[PDB]
Design a protein around this ligand. Structure first.
Ligand SMILES: *[C@@H]1O[C@H](CO[C@@H]2O[C@@H](C)[C@@H](O)[C@@H](O)[C@@H]2O)[C@@H](O[C@@H]2O[C@H](CO)[C@@H](O)[C@H](O)[C@H]2NC(C)=O)[C@H](O)[C@H]1NC(C)=O
Ligand SMILES: *[C@@H]1O[C@H](CO[C@@H]2O[C@@H](C)[C@@H](O)[C@@H](O)[C@@H]2O)[C@@H](O[C@@H]2O[C@H](CO)[C@@H](O)[C@H](O)[C@H]2NC(C)=O)[C@H](O)[C@H]1NC(C)=O
Ligand SMILES: *[C@@H]1O[C@H](CO[C@@H]2O[C@@H](C)[C@@H](O)[C@@H](O)[C@@H]2O)[C@@H](O[C@@H]2O[C@H](CO)[C@@H](O)[C@H](O)[C@H]2NC(C)=O)[C@H](O)[C@H]1NC(C)=O
Ligand SMILES: O=C(CC(c1ccccc1)c1ccccc1)NC[C@@H](O)CNCC1CCCCC1
Ligand SMILES: *[C@@H]1O[C@H](CO)[C@@H](O)[C@H](O)[C@H]1NC(C)=O
Ligand SMILES: *[C@@H]1O[C@H](CO)[C@@H](O)[C@H](O)[C@H]1NC(C)=O
Ligand SMILES: *[C@@H]1O[C@H](CO)[C@@H](O)[C@H](O)[C@H]1NC(C)=O
Ligand SMILES: [Cl-]
Ligand code: NA
Length: 527
């Protein structure tokens, strides 16, 4: 038996058998007063100490959220839905520590994605035991409030200031600082890493002064705050809030009176209305997300980035080959996970109307013109592939490249990756390629388990990525130094070198999506 004394009370863990060794796991440690009753929509509050032994032996509740439902019984979408009860009582975190207790281990903290509306840390693909076992790092992950209960904003009004989920994350970073030593971790070697909306969270911690001292380094997988979906303007945050207050019968004049009305509604009353606070959405709609609150974010983050106002440290940044395709089956016409989704030129034009609803007719012709310079005119997948690339280049790749250029221009080492391996167990059809979210299982080392029917090539690749990520955490340099690997060069503005990850041959390339990204980053803003 292992029991650890944390600054708030004793916690009891459990021991897991991994790869013929042992990992000690502490699942569901509370790290904040439960945000219930009058605490709804507030920043997380400090935890009251307990005298007993807390039995952190099962994953805790996941924060309230809407469950994905487009494909009932389909593992491709259900692997992402929560696997514990939904409750507002959900501010818990998990800790995996090597066996035996390490002396001064580097800590990796995971922040999951889910478009700031969904997510939970108990997903199978976020299991930190393999990293603990294989690399002797400590893995920490936390749950944070999502959707309206996590990001509803009437800015200035402390009854609902916005960024609550971000502050949840922050409080858990504070917990690791205050307690990870007791578990044998080094609070001075802490690396945030997250994917998608989690990677945008990580990026906002680089800007938040409150977070500057809570971590060492940062890994952004398929996400950054400069992505078009990542920050809600204060105008939209208030229209979205008033709309939700109308939809629930909570419109009052005194803005503080609205919040107490919203606090009396049931979580499902709010959750059911979240979809309609936007009149016309897109599949990338983030109805309740980060805002410039003047607390976590002291100014519009793009100004902070451009004027070097962020934590100076190393970053690891990267994207997947086919980021956009996932969104194509959540709304684009003629697309389906059950057929090859060959679409015509007309269907592609309505696809753009879906993803760019408020963009001029001239804007849409420019996208079309930029993305229909056929290598082979006769290829009938042409429009299908072009539409996924539009959505992927615009929503993930180009913003991550622009983030890495601007960040590295202030002198810190940056490393960029292009993940282009399609998991042999990927349940979505082949036309969807190397989708959003399906490098995570490689980062967490799931293919290291030989019983899981990943290929041998996948064991090698995951083993190399795990070593690169751990080396980045431990030493701020993502090399694999022992197995004649390709050396991973720094991303410099005036060359823009990146590393491709795959099974066949890891190579160095330059200026990824150069022409696409000039279009989206420089020209398209003018339309
Ligand atoms: C655990 O290790 C720290 C040092 O961690 C390293 O330095 C960090 C800045 C960061 O770069 C990490 O990735 C590194 O692994 C020890 O901290 C030192 O403690 C002495 C004690 O007198 C103090 O004088 C130093 O200023 C501290 N900082 C450094 C940088 O040396 C810490 O003592 C170690 N603790 C245990 C229990 O092993
Ligand atoms: C700001 O919000 C208003 C109100 O939104 C409407 O009411 C909400 C409760 C919710 O049900 C939304 O989906 C509604 O659309 C928006 O004004 C509406 O815009 C639509 C556009 O199709 C129009 O048909 C309605 O008549 C408008 N209703 C009112 C009362 O003005 C407005 O567009 C939002 N501003 C944005 C999104 O920039
Ligand atoms: C690919 O499928 C889409 C979606 O159709 C659904 O899935 C199919 C596998 C099959 O089960 C259909 O019966 C389902 O409706 C097809 O697009 C639909 O086309 C019909 C008729 O043209 C139209 O009424 C629907 O609104 C369309 N729905 C969507 C989401 O586009 C598409 O034609 C199929 N493409 C190919 C190449 O087979
Ligand atoms: O995952 C989200 C939000 C997210 C997104 C939405 C639809 C399709 C794909 C991803 C997102 C929205 C906006 C900006 C970035 C990411 N919601 C809960 C729910 O739908 C689950 N997701 C869908 C799957 C589809 C394949 C892999 C990714 C996850
Ligand atoms: C914690 O778990 C141990 C072992 O299963 C059990 O004996 C003990 O009663 C539990 N304590 C509490 C407070 O649940
Ligand atoms: C709104 O309510 C709060 C709390 O009751 C009060 O302090 C504030 O003065 C009220 N504002 C207005 C404009 O009535
Ligand atoms: C390097 O290669 C050996 C076998 O040749 C393998 O067992 C080991 O896990 C590899 N390490 C990494 C980090 O790829
Ligand atoms: Cl054509
Ligand atoms: Na390429």
């Amino acid at each position: 038996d292992i029991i650890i004394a944390t600054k708030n009370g004793k916690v009891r863990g459990m021991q897991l058998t991994v790869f013929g060794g042992t990992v000690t796991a502490f699942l569901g440690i509370p790290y904040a007063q439960p945000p219930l009753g009058r605490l709804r929509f507030k920043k997380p509050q400090s935890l009251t100490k307990w005298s007993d032994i807390w039995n952190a032996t099962k994953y805790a509740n996941s924060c309230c959220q809407n469950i994905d439902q487009s494909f009932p019984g389909f593992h491709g979408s259900e692997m992402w839905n929560p696997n514990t009860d939904l409750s507002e009582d959900c501010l818990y975190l998990n800790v995996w520590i090597p066996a035996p207790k390490p002396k001064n281990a580097t800590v990796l903290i995971w922040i999951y994605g889910g478009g700031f509306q969904t997510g939970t840390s108990s997903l199978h693909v976020y299991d930190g035991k393999f990293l603990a076992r294989v690399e002797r790092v400590i893995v920490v992950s936390m749950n944070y409030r999502v959707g309206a209960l996590g990001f509803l904003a009437l800015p200035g009004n402390p009854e609902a200031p916005g960024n609550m989920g971000l502050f949840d994350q922050q409080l858990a970073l504070q917990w690791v600082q205050k307690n990870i030593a007791a578990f044998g971790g080094n609070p001075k070697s802490v690396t945030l890493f997250g994917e998608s909306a989690g990677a945008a969270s990580v990026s906002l911690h680089l800007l938040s002064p409150g977070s500057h001292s809570l971590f060492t380094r940062a890994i952004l997988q398929s996400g950054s705050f400069n992505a078009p979906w990542a920050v809600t303007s204060l105008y939209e945050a208030r229209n979205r809030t008033l709309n939700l207050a109308k939809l629930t019968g909570c419109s009052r004049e005194n803005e503080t009176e609205i919040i107490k009305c919203l606090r009396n509604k049931d979580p499902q009353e709010i959750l059911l209305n979240e979809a309609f606070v936007v009149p016309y959405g897109t599949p990338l709609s983030v109805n309740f997300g980060p805002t410039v609150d003047g607390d976590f974010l002291t100014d519009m983050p793009d100004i902070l980035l451009e004027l070097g106002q962020f934590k100076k440290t190393q970053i690891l940044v990267g994207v997947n080959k086919d980021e956009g395709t996932a969104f194509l089956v959540y709304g684009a016409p003629g697309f389906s996970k059950d057929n090859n989704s060959i679409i015509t030129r007309k269907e592609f034009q309505e696809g753009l109307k879906i993803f760019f609803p408020g963009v001029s007719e001239f804007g849409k012709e420019s996208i079309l013109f930029h993305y229909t310079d056929w290598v082979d005119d006769q290829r009938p997948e042409n429009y299908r592939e072009a539409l996924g690339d539009v959505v992927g280049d615009y929503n993930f790749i180009c913003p991550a490249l622009e983030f890495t250029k601007k960040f590295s221009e202030w002198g810190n080492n940056a490393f960029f990756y292009y993940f282009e391996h399609r998991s042999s167990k990927l349940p979505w059809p082949e036309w969807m390629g190397v989708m959003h979210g399906y490098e995570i299982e490689f980062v967490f080392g799931l293919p290291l388990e030989r019983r899981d029917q990943y290929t041998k090539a996948e064991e090698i690749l995951s083993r190399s990525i795990v070593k690169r990520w751990a080396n980045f955490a431990k030493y701020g340099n993502p090399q694999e130094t022992q197995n004649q690997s390709t050396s991973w060069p720094v991303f410099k503005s005036t060359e823009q070198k990146y590393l491709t990850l795959n099974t066949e041959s890891t190579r160095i390339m330059t200026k990824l999506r150069a022409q696409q990204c000039r279009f989206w980053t420089s020209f398209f803003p003018k339309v």
